[PDB]
Amino acid sequence: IKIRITLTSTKVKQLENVSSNIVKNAEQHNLVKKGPVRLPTKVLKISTRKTPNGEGSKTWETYEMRIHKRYIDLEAPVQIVKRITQITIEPGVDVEVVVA
Amino acid sequence: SGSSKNCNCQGTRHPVFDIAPNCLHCGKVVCVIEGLNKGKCGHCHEQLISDKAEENPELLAAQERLDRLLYFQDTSAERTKIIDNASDFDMNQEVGLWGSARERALALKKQQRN
Amino acid sequence: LISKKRKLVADGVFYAELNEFFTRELAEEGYSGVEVRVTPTKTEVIIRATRTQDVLGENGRRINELTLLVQKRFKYAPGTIVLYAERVQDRGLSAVAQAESMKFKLLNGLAIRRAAYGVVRYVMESGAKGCEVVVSGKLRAARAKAMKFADGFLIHSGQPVNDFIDTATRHVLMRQGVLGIKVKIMRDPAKSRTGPKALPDAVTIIEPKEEEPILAPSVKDY
Amino acid sequence: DPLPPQVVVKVVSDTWIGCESTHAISFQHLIRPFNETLQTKLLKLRPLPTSALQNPLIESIYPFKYFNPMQTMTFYTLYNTNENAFVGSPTGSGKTIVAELAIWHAFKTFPGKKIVYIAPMKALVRERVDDWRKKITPVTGDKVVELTGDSLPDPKDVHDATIVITTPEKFDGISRNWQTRKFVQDVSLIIMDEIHLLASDRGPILEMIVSRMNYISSQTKQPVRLLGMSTAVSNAYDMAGWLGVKDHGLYNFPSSVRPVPLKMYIDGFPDNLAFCPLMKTMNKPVFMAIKQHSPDKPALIFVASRRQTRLTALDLIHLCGMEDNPRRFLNIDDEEELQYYLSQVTDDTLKLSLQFGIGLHHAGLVQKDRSISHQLFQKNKIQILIATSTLAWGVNLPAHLVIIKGTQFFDAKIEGYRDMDLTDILQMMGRAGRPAYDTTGTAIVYTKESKKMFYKHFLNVGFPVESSLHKVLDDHLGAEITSGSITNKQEALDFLSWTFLFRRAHHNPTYYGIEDDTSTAGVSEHLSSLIDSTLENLRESQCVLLHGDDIVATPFLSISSYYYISHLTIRQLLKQIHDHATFQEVLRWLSLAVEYNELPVRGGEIIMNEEMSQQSRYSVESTFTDEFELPMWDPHVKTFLLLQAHLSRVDLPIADYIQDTVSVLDQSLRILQAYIDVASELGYFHTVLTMIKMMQCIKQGYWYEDDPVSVLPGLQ
RNA sequence: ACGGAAGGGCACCACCAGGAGUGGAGCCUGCGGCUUAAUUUGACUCAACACGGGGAAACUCACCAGGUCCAGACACAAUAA
RNA sequence: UUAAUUGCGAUAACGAACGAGACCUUAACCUACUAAAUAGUGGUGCUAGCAUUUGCUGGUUAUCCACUUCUUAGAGGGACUAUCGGUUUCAAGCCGAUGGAAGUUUGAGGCAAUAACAGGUCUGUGAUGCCCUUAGACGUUCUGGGCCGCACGCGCGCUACACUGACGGAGCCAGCGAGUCUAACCUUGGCCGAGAGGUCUUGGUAAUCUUGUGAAACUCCGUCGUGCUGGGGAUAGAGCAUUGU
Ligand SMILES: [Mg+2]
Ligand SMILES: [Mg+2]
Ligand SMILES: [Mg+2]
Ligand SMILES: [Mg+2]
Ligand SMILES: [Mg+2]
Ligand SMILES: [Mg+2]
Ligand SMILES: [Mg+2]
Ligand SMILES: [Mg+2]
Ligand SMILES: [Mg+2]
Ligand SMILES: [Mg+2]
Ligand SMILES: [Mg+2]
Ligand SMILES: [Mg+2]
Ligand SMILES: [Mg+2]
Ligand SMILES: [Mg+2]
Ligand SMILES: [Mg+2]
Ligand SMILES: [Zn+2]
Ligand SMILES: [Zn+2]
Question: Distances in Å between the alpha carbon of D169 and those of A23, D203, D206, D213, D558?
Fold first, then answer.
């Protein structure tokens, strides 16, 4: 069946929480389970002048947004993967599931 | 369609085949996917579709109440009502006669007649 | 089909667009921030305000049209977006609500000195460790100047500023120009309950329990 | 049905203007257990009538050819498959034909098996057998043997038996012997009915049985089939996740669809009478309701207590006088035949009430008097069948109207009146409505105003079935574990893992008393604390010795299976046993059993209890002394005096004591058997000799000084 | 506050010991000036001059030679099928 | 004495607050934990070349088996100037040696107090008071110019003025990033064309495809030879395409 779930939230502490109950849900159900894979962190950077006008010393500001993404692979019949998606939803943690 | 995917859902996750709801030999429920990809039973490999006095009488009677059972389920929204002895039961269809009081002015006219 | 690099950025702008819409509509309903939580097939938005009845209204009239307003602009299908209404806990400890209170007093002709002390006094009485309100503009004269009002103590540098200080800025429109209002409130670290419970430079030592010498070798057999 | 965005609680003043305070409450605690599964009635128009069964022997019987329409999903799903399924059947909509799917399930694959049926009450047991003695055995050639506390068949008959019907309590005793009783090896399918009684007292007994087969199936590595027979249950998913059923098959139909439609009415009665005066206020409105709703059709009224079975009859017959026919609807045209049935009537209310068309039934009559009220109603001679709530489990009475006469039956545990649980009155409506006799049926639920809104809101919806094992959880922990399956507490957590409690404890922590944390981790220490409580409450009974993480099956815990043991009884009499036990000493010990505490002591019995205390051979005041001194009201004192009366053949002052004596004598043999095994292990030969003299005296009702020859018939 | 007043301590937007450079040449680019109808404009030491995120063919565009449109809500009076 | 009103202390002051520091992000250390065909490693299968005698270089996605040293992380640890020797009312501290991945607060940053400037900004804003315009309107829109205009003076800059070079062949190594939905982005591959570029497809919403970004400076073998010269590449003319009306 090869169920794959990807999680791409910005805040990591809940993202580690969501990946914590999922991994133990499979083993407690005696499911062949593939460990979570933590992809390299994506650092989205924007650099801009601080001043609104054109006056002053050329001071530059850097802003960063971090994207933490993991995936976990599951292999099991549909009747248990369908009872995973509707739960483990917490604020600001994007979750999607792909079949096959 | 010739698909070999034997969908044995029995209508759990798919709509049932209207023409062939079940197996007439071993009772397996055949859904639309199961009916479309094969006309044979999944379990006992029996044909699903062949290529009132005469009809069995109580067989026709069985579906009469069965349709009522479906009718009861379809019309079960209002069967949950409680009669009570404190409900006004305004009996108005959707409004109090357009929110307008002149039908009882005749009763006032009747009272003027009295 | 949008990449996750652009999806999260487009999600933050959705939060940014949705945030400024409420502060311009519920300005007299005490809007105090919004939160967006995404669930498959069901998107929910939590409005936080001081007056939960006005945000809801009779039969949820206001929240329905506000939910319906979001539907039209963002092209969300009916039944996908649902708005909530929730009161704000510890209204004295929210800078945004107290920023509105400062603006409210000025527009009614109240004195700048007395009104400013009123905002900081309520915040201090509500359990805040520190509070600071800054008023800038043409005060009693054409020549503009700033007047800072504060109580307790507020940190200014380091990471804990983000953790403990909430900042609110609200422009005020008056007949003589524009008066700026800035409110910073520092809550007690002892009630944070999310992350740090104290300043990084606070060290607390558990008092040891004294015990007199036994003065005699003895055994308690079992 | 469409969930609102929030729930709003508005409080407004009554005199001032604008004194309003509103709260908006969100509910995001919506998990899959918090749902109603249900199944829409789909288009399955064509059935498989009889002929589509491929067995001439079965098709030659059951002349019902039209196949059960309310089996829409079921039909032949379990006929061939070996997968567990849950079936919710409201009312008597196939309770008999579906229960016979066990033979259709796998008996053809392997014949000559001993599939066991389970019923929650012995009243069902009699009818689950008698109806099938002329239905299955004469045609299938398979015999069925009853297994109850009153029947002790030969083990060879039980081994060769094909079907076994047993209450969960009686199945527990034989299931205590799973290790050595070679009889239980042929279990392939287990079927039980009326399974939503876990909230009741007997539910925990049945609940722990299911977890037993789960461990049997798990270790032995072969599946054991199950089948759940019940009515509409709100929390179907949790039961589905505990019964071990799979996706293919789940039967949850609501009470909306029934063979006979049900009409229900609500009425309120004033809140200034506690229990007693609110029978005169309610008896009269019952009379008008019977005539209005059941003019010429049978009615049925459910009184609260045993005495109210009489009081309602007294007033209703009195109110029946003020109309045309005082003996209305007697349905006895022949006066000569009228006196025929009245001849068999014994005494008391039945003598002067059966002539009015009203029948009475309660557990205070002759065993044939209870039946007499039924056969007359079987051919519709009597109309009113005023009875107790305990009759909603026995014979299926085809009545039309069910009346809830009052509410809030008394509970002895709280010395007060408590609201009736929403498990019995819901089933009590099932008697209303006669299949193929009348179109629709009516029901009325008369209640106090404070509870009037509660039943309007939730009577149709129903409530989740809850597990009440953690009131007797200390007793049945050693039911399956005293064999020596687990030695350490680490796996003791595993022993309770697949019980029904975890299916509701984590889902509904509030009901079970959890108030600290609702998370699965938060409940983990709470459930372990209960496990820690269970082992420590067994320590003061000095039955188990702890070696840290290890538990020890001591000789005191050695007798916990093969025989019912209440554990708490062991410690009470542990410091009393001695080799030279006298006859007087043991008579005190027999009445000290905890199981005898259930004997009721009616008001004013102390006066008559004291009278026979001196009349008894061993007075209570001279027997229960110092630490063993007991109050005269205590049932142990009453039980001690009852045994002496039986030995001395002393006539009891009232007939009520006779029923108690029969109950006391019923458990006398099994309770006395406990001391035989205990004394045998200790080698107290003198005590053992004393034991044999007791049941001989008890069986023949004669003292040890009496001549055994006089016991023979015709001899005083 | 200032001192071509004293005392103590610091800094490669200071110096020493040096490095590599700019200033010299061509070219890109900004500023001033001159020109023009317009060559739109801000910033005059550090703290402006590859700065206005200003690398402008049209847009941007704010300047010039010209041409359209009214997006003047609403209320009042007038003309008026 | 410290980078520090940083500390030891003295003491008509005691007790505090802000700032510094702590904090946060990043860089390095772990053959320690959980791992990971979207990263690899060794071996087993099929297979190419040479020696053939045990090998070396390799190729292989539905060929598997085991692992996380290298690569990514999440949770942790690790440094506090540790030990020692000197100097100091012998206090804070400082110097030196050893050990250490790391010992100039470890390096580098974010944040960063009070009081001010009539510093810049009305041309970022539907943020603005007041003033001006408000219908051949300073509004908007369309066409074409200009902001590039050139006697001249300055700043930020890039190319060099040569053999530590230039040119021609080969050698061949990074890291930070980015990439298409109602769009047409990053483009590998085949073919055509000096070249620029053009055509047909392909993979990629992306650790998996561009991409080992096979980058340049640089390394080696050859030509030139102290010559405004094969240094230098503006100034000008002709032709071939692309961006875009
Ligand atoms: Mg220096
Ligand atoms: Mg120098
Ligand atoms: Mg140079
Ligand atoms: Mg400076
Ligand atoms: Mg250009
Ligand atoms: Mg232009
Ligand atoms: Mg233009
Ligand atoms: Mg190979
Ligand atoms: Mg030293
Ligand atoms: Mg630092
Ligand atoms: Mg500005
Ligand atoms: Mg310019
Ligand atoms: Mg510059
Ligand atoms: Mg690289
Ligand atoms: Mg050249
Ligand atoms: Zn299907
Ligand atoms: Zn079939």
Answer: 41, 10, 7, 16, 21
CA angle D145, D149, D155 (to 5 degrees): 45
CATH number of residue C67's parent domain? 3.30.300.20
Closest nt by CA–C1' to A47: E53
Distance CA C84, CA D24 (A): 8
C-alpha angle with apex D106: D105 to D112, nearest 5 degrees? 130
Distance (Å, rounded) from C-alpha D701 to C-alpha D650?
10
Distance CA D693, CA C61 (A): 85
Both tokens of D345, joined, read 């009537």
Give the minimum alpha-carbon distance from C68 to chain A in angstroms, rounded to a whole number.
Answer: 22
**Strands D268-269 and D410-411, how do they pair?**
unpaired
Q: Residues 154-173 of C near strand F (Cβ < 7 Å)?
A: 154-161, 171, 173
CA separation (Å) from D406 to C120, D264, D312, D389, D412? 62, 15, 11, 12, 18
- What token pair was written down for A5? 């779930």
Q: B40 - beta bridge partners?
A: B47
How long is the CA C142 to C1' F132 vector, in angstroms? 22
Q: Give A38's Cβ-side CA count (13 Å radius).
A: 9
**Reduced to 3 states, what is the DSSP secondary structure of residue D433?**
coil
Closest C-alpha to D125, from D162, D91, D163: D163
- Please state the three-class secondary structure of chain C as a single string: CCCHHHHHHHHHHHHHHHHHHHHHHCCCCCEEEEEEEEECCEEEEEEEECCHHHHHCHHHHHHHHHHHHHHHHHCCCCCCEEEEEEECCCHHHCHHHHHHHHHHHHHCCCCHHHHHHHHHHHHHHCCCCEEEEEEEECCCCCCCEEEEEEEECCCCCCCHHHHHEEEEEEEEEECCEEEEEEEEEECCHHHCCCCCCCCCCCCCCCCCCCCCCCCCCCCCCC
Residue in D closest to A79 by C-alpha: D247
Structure-block tokens of residue B4? 């070999």
- Please state, in angstroms and rounded to a whole number, the distance separating the CA atoms of residues C49 and C16: 17
Query: What is the number of alpha carbons within 13 Å of residue D397 lying toward its C-beta?
Result: 33
C216, two tokens: 């005699």
Q: Do B59 and D43 touch (CB under 8 A)?
A: no
Q: Is residue D299 classed as helix, strand or coil in its secondary structure?
A: strand
Q: Which domain holds residue A90?
A: 1-100
Residue ranges of the alpha helices (H) in D200-302? 203-220, 236-243, 280-293
Q: Which residue is nearest to nucleotide F71 (CA to C1')?
A: A40
Q: Do D5 and C63 touch (CB under 8 A)?
A: yes
Domain count along chain A: 1
Pairing relation of β-strands C31-39 and C42-49?
Answer: antiparallel
Closest CA to C186 of C104, C142, C143, C123: C123
> How big, in percent rounded to 5, are the helix, strand and coil portions of chain A?
25, 35, 40
Contact between D511 and D504 (Cβ < 8 Å): yes
Resolution reading in Å: 3.5
Chain A span 52-71 residues with beta carbon within 7 Å of strand E:
53-58
Q: What is the 3-state secondary structure (H, E, C) of D555-585?
A: HHHHCCCCCCCCCHHHHHCCCCCCCCCCHHH
**Alpha-carbon gap, residue D497 to D14, rounded angstroms:** 54
Shortest distance between the Cα of D551 and any Cα of chain C, in A, equals 20
* Cβ contact, residue pair B8, D76, below 8 Å: no
Dig out the tokens for C221 from the structure. 């057999």
